[PDB]
Design a protein around this ligand. Structure first.
Ligand SMILES: CCCCCCCCCO[C@@H]1O[C@H](CO)[C@@H](O)[C@H](O)[C@H]1O
Ligand SMILES: CCCCCCCCCO[C@@H]1O[C@H](CO)[C@@H](O)[C@H](O)[C@H]1O
Ligand SMILES: CCCCCCCCCO[C@@H]1O[C@H](CO)[C@@H](O)[C@H](O)[C@H]1O
Ligand SMILES: CCCCCCCCCO[C@@H]1O[C@H](CO)[C@@H](O)[C@H](O)[C@H]1O
Ligand SMILES: CCCCCCCCCO[C@@H]1O[C@H](CO)[C@@H](O)[C@H](O)[C@H]1O
Lengths: 310, 310, 310, 310, 310
């Protein structure tokens, strides 16, 4: 018959979310409660009712007693898991109480950047039993699992936390137990507002002010340099994300600014060609369309993306 | 009844404060004095009264004698704690004297950048007992805890150090002992003065000198390029800090320079529009307002932030 | 006679492909099935039919029993192999079932950048037996080897996976067993399209718009600065790749833009030299060739590379 | 009575000096000679007169024999000390010969950047006895301590090496032994000459050549851009050093170039204001002062810093 | 008498050459054959003639039998040596066969950048015996030592590999054995050709095209900005190398472009001063010298360095 293994996972800290590598790092405590009647013991008066063991000697005790422990893996773990504590408390009954304090990076494969920077992401930790459900069954250790209240993350804000149990078939034919700690997080837009939206909007607004100088050459030089600035912002954005196979809301926003700036160069080349061919009066009359086109083009663009993505 | 565990923590070095990741790194010595009568021993004349042990064999001795050690965790630790020394001296009485020399990063979750770079921050190390207060009670080891006199930090300056004891309920239902080493540090502003204030002030002051050329086009070109430089400083500042969800004193300062520069472009476009419409005499008379507005706008802005933040 | 060693390798995650260092990193599970009759055991009723061991004690058991284990090496491994699990299950029969869960970087020496960014690459993991084929023979553990379906890689897309067995002669005179897990991957061009092709095409197209202004000096200034932008893109590309001893498709593409831009400066210098020598009418007539040359030169260049590389 | 512990430290390599973090890294060999009569042994003919032990088993032998070893700490060490060799050779007499080969970073708290880049710095390694002087006394192991002849450091040049013994009171009430290996190193100025002095001098000299064009507007544009270049060099310099609370010779040098460039903008604004107000003859006569002021200002500045710092 | 220790070292991979830190990283296999008659053993018929050991238990066996192993050090090693395999096979005779598979960085102190990028460098691995030549003598294990055929290095090309034996006196009075694996490597110039020579040559050639416009002011502006580009290339080059105390061929090349560009500014200032003083005809006649000087100056410079360095 199978023995119930009580799994509990609590994230104390978010040491960082690295969206370029699609992983996240936490400081966490894993807690297990497992009753093995074979490990039960008798004690003399004065002698303790609870035996405390370093994992090393407790595993060495299990091998001796020919007992199989609920060997588990953090399925989505990455690199080195640095351990703080690996302590066992064994009661007279045979109840094993295990605590595992660690720092570790975990794969974040649920990353969907299509709406970046207005995106919401799913982050999880998968705890799998190496042995199948006929031997060990994972149960939810109540009153422990979740996320702490001093996570240390400033950009991300955790919207909800969940725990559930499911099956996996990684090393076995038959179903094997899997404990899941899941959390959803959305982004604080302040960085994007201050470093990307406000600057891009300023460059566009103060560039439009110069249309009132009525110097077509000067607009051409301005739109040309503006195009270079947007290409530079395009590199600034791309450095935050992985080399995705798909278009971002931000990517569509930058391609939009490229198109409008390209047309600004084209139109003002045409108005200055009119001036060069002794048609200054005509270019000046058409200039009202060029001056009111600019704000309408960027405002039409903003409504196009907002529709295309929402 | 509970046994008194004497905790002492001394920070020898500050290997660095990383404000982008909100953590700090220290070289420290942890000192514990714990009397366990069960560990007492007899000795013959001439034979030593003090037994020296490597943690490995001392823990192996505790497991043998069925003794529970005051298992502790550095609650706010991050990653790998690289150890230099883990040495035990056991007296005939049963007094365990433990020394733990390490290099380690700790979470700095008390980071408040709202007044950056004129900010004061709290840094701490939390030492928690895994076992509750009915088993072990942490006491303050006197004459040891604090911060050394060659910390190696150049930007930060420690204002005060404190040690105290409190309860925690991390793994238990009932209260458990927690030792706290806290320190407050303020920043040396010289870097910000030399690399950010002086340059930004120079760009503004030498740009104002060119107002005396009375060339409105030249002011427009200068304010436009100045706006680009401020956007670049905006990125230089943002790279020092995390992607905060809130506004910095520095952020307000940069947004301010954007607004004033935006208006400088707008005003000088208007003066040059006057010159283009055969109203050069009028633009020249108004120019006194444009020339005296510039210094007043930046000086009014500086007094607005200084009021809004203090 | 030689004993069959059943090798199985499964890649769960691609933590990254680093093309500058020509290596890749995976999270993988190694599975071995090996029957050693010498390890067989008798059991009493109630006592388990399968003994579970930590690698440490199982190797200690092999040394005791004077048994030689199929010692292996990951031939193309690099640096530290961080291990998650190293577990042995020994059946009454003497069937050793070994599981090795790890994170590791592996050399990618098959890297051919000649067609970058339209390149397809071979990535493999080599598992070698230290002892020759007279002692141990590697066999393919069926229904396990391959690559998972949540690899976490965004730029690369795996086209096919293969497993095969071959000989090696690394430490021995005679042939020794080698297990091979191979995979082919092609690149998602979206990053190159969005950050390199679209910008380079825009700079070229909007620069051509200005030819309609008929200002030869302005074209010279524009082509000069365009040349600097392409040199900057040249550095942006070179930072992604190693310092190769051969020419890339991308390198040929950039050298092409340098040549065309060089000639644009040369031609427009000539047209402006005509204007300076009172031959404005002649320069204006020739200008049709200069205006239609530009698009044809870049379109002729694109067909030249596309032929020279395909 | 106290036993003499012979300490010897030899630095084979300087893996790097990181002045931003104020630390340095070495590959070194620690050598200890300690006679413990209790460890003495008898040997049979043919049996060795010197017993060789891995530190692990030698410490295990000391615990058994109830002997206290001279437990030491590298006081100024930082992070992980990677070990190559930890070997003990025990003679029939009881003379312990210990060798410790390691790679490690050490705190450099003696860093004085006030004269950078013409600075000389003190680097040391502190080896402390955990037990006081009544138990163990450190002595200087003769003919071993120092620095090798293939250190691998290219920027720094070691001027002298010293060894001495002093007391410390880190974990004890009474004085405890401390071994010191100290070295002084000065900087090779070639990098600063080639990448900072020559460029800054060229920008200044070739900018002065343009004064002979007698175009005041052109000088204003040149000095404005020069000011931006110096702000960029200011960032290039600041990236090499920590965020110091004090002024560098280099910082004074850059602030100087800012002031002179600021005045160049101011003066040439004035000369062009004269030209604009029909006083070109006056501006042209005063221009001799503006042309000879420039070289004298930078040469007067250089003599001011050279006095203020030496 | 001394026992022959057969050393063999094979480099499988070059994980990288870091010329800024003057070190290199390899994946290598160390092989030792050492006959110790004391380790010989008896076996019954059917029982194995070869005993296979994990280094841990084999060293524990040597300590037990009171045998001294040929303790060695990788003299030029740096940081952590990550081990893949540490396996011993002991024959009935007492022949120890040891295999050490590792990833490690080694100091490269033979680095001579004086002719960079046309430089050839020496790279080596030093394997030293801790015990002197009276105890152990290193011999060359034949048919193993060298470098593999899938090194994975793209920039460097290995010209030759050598193995030899020499003495060292690191920890002893008398000579001690040292095994040497040496290799020479030259650089693939393609990176330098594509990213540094072609761009610098283009900037120079297309800048010369504009001399045919006969606008002295425009040449001054072009040479001024060219000087800034060369200062930027000067930083791009310096970032690849350590902060050397000597001049590079590349450094001489950049200082040369600074001088020629400085003179271009000077000459064209003079020609424009002639035009300003109503001597346009004279400046136009002298212009032939200025136009033909430019190509001759750079071609004379290139022949000067090529002579000064070869
Ligand atoms: C930059 C946006 C500011 C808009 C107001 C117009 C004033 C001029 C701004 O400077 C100019 O900006 C161009 C575009 O970035 C560059 O091509 C050019 O070299 C630079 O002189
Ligand atoms: C910029 C701070 C220095 C002010 C002194 C005035 C002289 C000219 C300095 O160069 C200016 O640089 C800006 C930024 O690139 C350009 O927008 C602008 O057109 C250009 O004239
Ligand atoms: C950037 C190409 C955009 C084409 C639109 C034409 C308007 C001018 C764009 O600014 C150009 O930017 C270069 C940056 O290097 C300068 O060298 C060049 O003198 C300047 O005129
Ligand atoms: C620039 C140092 C070399 C001086 C030699 C005189 C020729 C002109 C150099 O081009 C300068 O480039 C700056 C870029 O920042 C601009 O701001 C400035 O207006 C422009 O004149
Ligand atoms: C860049 C080399 C190309 C040579 C052909 C001349 C076309 C103009 C290229 O733009 C130039 O950029 C320089 C660097 O910023 C400025 O100094 C210069 O005054 C400006 O005109």
């Amino acid at each position: 018959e199978p023995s119930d293994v009580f799994i509990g996972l609590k994230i104390d800290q978010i040491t960082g979310i690295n969206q370029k590598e699609e992983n996240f790092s936490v400081v966490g405590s894993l807690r297990i409660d497992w009753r093995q009647p074979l490990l039960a013991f008798e004690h003399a008066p004065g002698e303790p009712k609870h035996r405390t063991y370093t994992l090393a000697t407790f595993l060495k005790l299990l091998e001796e007693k020919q007992i199989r422990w609920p060997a588990f893996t953090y399925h989505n773990q990455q690199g080195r898991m640095d351990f703080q504590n690996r302590l066992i408390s064994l009661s007279e009954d045979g109840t094993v109480m295990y605590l595992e304090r660690f720092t570790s990076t975990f794969q974040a494969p649920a990353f969907d950047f299509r709406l970046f920077p207005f995106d919401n992401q799913l982050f999880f930790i998968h705890v799998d039993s190496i042995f199948p459900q006929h031997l060990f069954r994972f149960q939810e250790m109540q009153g422990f699992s979740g996320l702490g209240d001093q996570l240390g993350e400033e950009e991300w804000i955790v919207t909800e936390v969940n725990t559930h149990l499911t099956t996996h078939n990684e090393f076995t034919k038959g179903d094997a137990s899997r404990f899941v700690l899941e959390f959803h997080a959305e982004r604080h837009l302040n960085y994007y507002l201050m470093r990307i939206l406000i600057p891009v909007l300023l460059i566009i607004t103060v560039s439009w002010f110069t249309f009132f100088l009525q110097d077509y050459t000067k607009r051409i030089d301005l739109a040309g340099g503006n195009l270079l600035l947007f290409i530079a912002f395009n590199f600034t954005i791309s450095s935050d994300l992985p080399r995705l196979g798909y278009i971002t809301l931000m990517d569509a926003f930058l391609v939009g600014t490229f198109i409008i700036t390209a047309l600004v160069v084209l139109g003002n080349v045409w108005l200055r060609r009119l001036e060069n061919h002794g048609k200054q009066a005509l270019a000046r009359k058409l200039d009202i369309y060029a001056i009111t086109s600019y704000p309408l083009a960027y405002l039409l663009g903003a409504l196009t993306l907002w529709l295309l993505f929402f």
